[model samples]
Target: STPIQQLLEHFLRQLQRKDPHGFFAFPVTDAIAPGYSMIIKHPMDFGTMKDKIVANEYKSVTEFKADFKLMCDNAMTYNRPDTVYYKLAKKILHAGFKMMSKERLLALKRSM
Candidate 1:
């Protein structure tokens, strides 16, 4: 697997441990067609990006960081601020930034 995939896989694994409900949880959306009418707008929605990672469709980590940051920020907006997912989203965002920074540092060290 690519480094990008490896990083996401590790992130998902850790997320699974922290968020056992997984990233596919029923979103807090306005869809009301029938029972379980659903839509993607929260962090779970961002989980769809896993398919993109699996397909190697992303151009760079910068793209992933931008999308991930947007998702984390929106997760709070979509869900109640006091909810567990809302809190986890911030922690996950922090980890995402730290991981990217660490990766950049390692790359710089290797280049030097």
Candidate 2:
């Protein structure tokens, strides 16, 4: 759980900066789709998916799978996307990785 969370937070934080070397440019228009995947099945939906989670409208009912869901579901939330929320969330995840290992996650019902 902790390793997953740390990796995700780092991914998001890395995304926050302007595209470094124009590599992995993230489009705000694709915010809800999970990734900036080049071949999107439908049109880009503009808006933050973060909001849907807060509204509790995004029931994980789809067959579509993405690795990010795991981190989002298990990582702790603090709610200030830019600061308080991200920092503490990452910290707790880091602590978990430091203390727990792969066997720990398997014991906790987390899939590897």
Candidate 3:
């Protein structure tokens, strides 16, 4: 997949794990943009995740789901009630959920 899609999938993986962090908990800096403040939450550490992506380390979508969960959960709490970030949080999560459900192979894993 493309880099943007790779990044997006990583976030989606974090959601599957339900891993929360300070960044996801905070509010949005710019309500109009949606992901401005998100970069500050862990700009430094993001490189680690980025490296994995650059190296093509992700074998499955599951890793992407876990990583994304960690990002969004903390991003909401990272800032105050800016509403912009919070709104973005909701939208990101909702979209991720849709993708997760569509990847029924994992969704059905539990039943198997």
Candidate 4:
């Protein structure tokens, strides 16, 4: 497998591990999330990210990170701060930044 593909998969797994409730596992729809379509202009989720990786749509780590942030931010924006979804998104976003930090990624690159 390609290096970028392997790295993205690894990152996705790590992020998914943080979200045990699976709130971010799939795209949110109007049926489950009322006004979600009207509120969130760009919807993103783990499943879509996985699909993008499989299709080789991400040209760089920057693009992958953008989608991850978009997914979490969408949840944070639509849900109240006290809500479980909002809190979970905050946690996942923080963990993702740490896991994908420049120093950590550089170390992984060297190891590879």
How far off is residue 1 in model 4, in Å?
2.6
Flag regions of model 4 displaced more than 4 Å. 110-112
lDDT: worst 10-residue window of model 1? 32-41
TM for candidate 4 is 0.94
Best by lDDT: 4
The Cα local distance difference test for each model comes to: 0.63, 0.35, 0.56, 0.91
- Lowest summed-lDDT stretch of 10 residues in model 4? 103-112
* Cα RMSD, each candidate: 4.5, 13.5, 9.0, 1.2
- Per-residue lDDT of 1-112 in model 4, one digit per residue for the tens? 6878998999999999988888889989999999999999999999999999999999999899999999988988999999999989998899898988888879977996
* Deviation in Å, model 2, residue 57 alpha carbon: 3.0
Sorted by TM-score (best first), the order is 4, 1, 3, 2
Question: How many pairs of residues collide in model 1?
Answer: 0
Lowest-scoring 10 consecutive residues by lDDT in candidate 2? 61-70
Error of 4 at 100 (Å): 0.4
